[PDB]
Design a protein around this nucleic acid. Structure first.
Lengths: 60, 650
DNA sequence: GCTGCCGCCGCC
RNA sequence: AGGCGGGC
């Protein structure tokens, strides 16, 4: 998808590195708690982060 | 005639100095040494054609009345293209700052070997000196005897296998950190003298020192001397050192910690007698000493110590003999090697208690003394001196180098001596891991001797492998192997003698001998494989591919035994035995060893490490429970960690 | 000393 | 993205 810095972090998410914690996937509460997305960010929750205009077009 | 058992050397003013024993210390300055240069004649030329041309030209530049030169037939089989397998060369003996470039192209010759020859290397090769041995041979040194010789030919090696007694001095240094300048200052020094250490006989356990003395300055058993400052202490230290005149300085983390500090403090405090740390006398430090070059400074210190062997039990060499250690902390090494307990005291002289509390100061000084005595006993128990000496004699390099822990050291000399003796011109200078917890016993199998066996089986050599010297990336097709064979055979003879040998002393000695032979043979690959004076990419590749085939079949064999390879590489292969019993696991391991040898009769693998449990995380990152057997068969578990976050500084 | 920036090293 | 350490 990305057509030194990243390999380790992805293995670390699987509990394969360092303290070997098998990190739990985030629930909505956790996702919503992260800093709000700005321009160029895609994390967060579209129901909170998108305008009603954008949500309506997606739902249509 | 003059008889000296040489230990170490140093280069100075285009001369070569040897320090050794005659028993008192002695130095021999060697003059008249020359580089052996070999002029390669062009198509249709002779050594005399060269002789006429360059000799008059050399006499002028260097200003010599006469220069010894003679024709000599030499072979060449290394990586330089266009140079023939064998030719008549002109051997020019050019006495030892302007060097003759190798590309000296003339109408007589086109190439020259031995232009940048090192003086110590020249002496040792020409006189066929193979490590520390007996040699039949004003105010320059700290030695009892100072002599010189007009020509190197005056020195010839002897066959004597025995050696003189050594004077060892164990050093333990306690320091203090000044936060102002970030400088580790010396608070105390312990000196324990063992004036008669014989490597020809086993060293008695818990050997008692001939003299014990501690020097100490204010931070804020044996003799104890108190000083008003650090400068007076270090001056006294240097004087005592000169008088003691040890052949070996034993310690723990001297090489890269305490020895550097000591030198730098002697520098800082302008100690005039600093040079007694070695056996050569110097009035001044090197010009570029203390230029903030932690890399170059190390060289200067090693050089200044020349004449006295640095026996560091916790350096790269020392660690290799104590693989059952994990931190290599002094207390840990003492426990592992001697099976005796010592609780390390954390001495911090910045603490105010040490200024007025006589009992605190006394406890700290007692800690330092104990540590010194421990360092010595460990060094003798692990037999660091004997093994490194053997390795030096096998490779024919300098003992100092071996005690240091170099890779291009015993691997370059061993080859220069073999090839030079046989009339050759020498060059100028994997299985993805099964990540997870493994409940069944896992055995680490060591394939160190993979490559040597490969080089010996397929007869891989610089002299045998036709290769494209223009294109080193070209894979070619199937002296060095004969040398390997000799080492293997000798090792066999030692083991055969071991089965019969009854004397615990002679037995242990045999064990050291075979260890030395094994290490020497298992270090031969680096010669041609590491990117090395004898580097040859086509040869490295050729050996590697055969190593891949062998390993692939090996994987198949393990699987054939219903075993699973948890991890593997060119050095080792870890196999899950599928057992929960030490005995059952060992039987599996032996069956695997035997199986592999039947397929590869010159490849002898063995069980190196037994893991009761193994949590594998990456290639070289795991935690495990190693099983260490005791004398009475008794088995004990111990934690071992490599590469985990827990190994980062903290 | 602190502050701030840039690079590297893992962790969380 | 955050924290810690080292260097300039």
């Amino acid at each position: 998808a990305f057509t030194k810095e990243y390999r380790y972090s992805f293995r670390h998410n699987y509990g394969l590195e360092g303290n070997r914690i098998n990190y739990k996937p985030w629930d909505c509460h956790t996702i919503l708690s992260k800093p709000r997305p700005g321009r160029g960010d895609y994390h967060g929750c579209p129901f909170r982060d998108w305008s009603h205009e954008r949500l309506s077009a997606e739902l249509r | 005639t003059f008889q000296m058992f040489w230990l170490d050397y140093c280069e100075v003013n285009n001369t070569l100095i040897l320090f050794g024993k005659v028993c008192v210390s002695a130095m021999v300055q060697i003059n008249g040494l020359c580089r052996e240069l070999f002029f390669l004649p062009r198509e249709g030329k002779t050594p005399t054609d060269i002789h006429e041309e360059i000799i008059p030209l050399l006499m002028d530049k260097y200003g010599l009345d006469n220069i010894r030169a003679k024709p000599q037939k030499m072979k060449y089989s290394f990586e330089l293209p266009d140079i023939p397998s064998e030719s008549d060369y002109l051997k020019v003996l050019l006495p030892y700052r302007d060097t003759i470039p190798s590309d000296l192209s003339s109408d007589t010759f086109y190439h020259v070997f031995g232009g940048n020859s090192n003086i110590f290397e020249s002496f040792v090769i020409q006189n066929r000196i193979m490590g520390p041995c007996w040699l039949d041979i004003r105010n320059a040194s700290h030695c009892a005897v100072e002599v010189s010789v007009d020509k190197p030919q005056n020195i010839t090696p002897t066959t004597t296998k025995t050696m003189p007694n050594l004077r060892c001095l164990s050093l333990s240094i306690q320091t203090l950190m000044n936060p102002k300048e970030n400088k580790q200052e010396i608070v105390s020094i312990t000196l324990s003298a063992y004036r008669n250490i014989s490597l020809d006989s086993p060293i008695p356990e818990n050997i008692k020192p001939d003299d014990l003395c501690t020097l100490v300055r204010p931070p804020q058993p044996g003799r104890v001397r108190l000083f008003n400052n650090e400068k007076a202490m270090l001056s006294c230290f240097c004087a005592m050192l000169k008088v003691e005149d040890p052949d070996v300085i034993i310690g723990h983390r001297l090489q890269n910690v305490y020895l550097d500090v000591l030198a730098h403090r002697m520098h800082d405090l302008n100690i005039p007698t600093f040079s007694s740390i070695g056996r050569r006398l110097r009035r001044t430090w090197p010009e570029k000493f203390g230029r903030g070059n932690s890399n170059m400074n190390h060289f200067f210190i090693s050089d200044i110590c020349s004449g006295r062997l640095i026996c560091d039990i916790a350096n790269e060499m020392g660690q290799s003999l104590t693989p059952k250690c994990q931190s290599w902390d002094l207390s840990e090494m003492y426990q592992v090697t001697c099976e005796k307990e010592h609780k390390p005291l954390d001495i911090d002289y910045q603490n105010p208690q040490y200024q007025n509390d006589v009992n605190s100061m006394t406890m700290a000084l007692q800690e330092n003394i104990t540590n010194c005595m421990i360092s010595a006993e460990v060094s003798y128990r692990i037999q660091l001196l004997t093994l490194t000496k053997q390795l030096t004699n096998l490779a024919g390099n300098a003992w100092a180098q071996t005690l240091g822990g170099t890779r291009a050291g015993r691997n370059e000399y061993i080859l220069l001596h073999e090839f030079s003796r046989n009339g050759f011109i020498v060059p100028d200078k994997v299985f993805e891991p099964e990540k997870g917890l493994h409940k069944n016993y896992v055995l680490v199998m060591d394939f160190n001797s993979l490559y040597p066996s490969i080089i010996q089986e397929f007869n891989i050599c610089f002299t045998t492998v036709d290769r494209n010297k223009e294109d080193i990336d070209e894979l070619p097709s199937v002296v060095l192997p004969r040398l390997l064979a000799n080492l293997v055979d000798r090792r066999r003879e030692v083991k055969k003698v071991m089965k019969t040998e009854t004397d615990p002393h002679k037995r242990v000695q045999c064990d050291i001998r075979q260890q030395a032979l094994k290490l020497t043979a298992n270090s031969m690959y680096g010669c041609l494989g590491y990117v090395s004076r004898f580097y040859a990419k086509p040869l490295a590749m050729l050996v590697t591919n055969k190593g891949r085939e062998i390993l692939m079949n090996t994987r198949q064999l393990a699987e054939s035994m219903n075993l699973l390879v948890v991890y593997g590489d060119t050095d080792s292969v870890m196999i899950d035995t599928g057992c929960d019993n030490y005995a059952d696991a060992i039987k599996i391991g032996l069956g695997f060893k035997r199986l592999v040898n039947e397929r590869y009769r010159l490849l002898e693998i063995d069980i190196d490490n037994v893991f009761k449990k193994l949590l594998l995380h990456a290639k070289k990152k795991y935690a495990a429970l190693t099983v260490n057997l005791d004398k009475n068969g008794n088995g004990t578990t111990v934690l071992e960690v490599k590469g985990l976050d827990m190994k980062r500084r903290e």
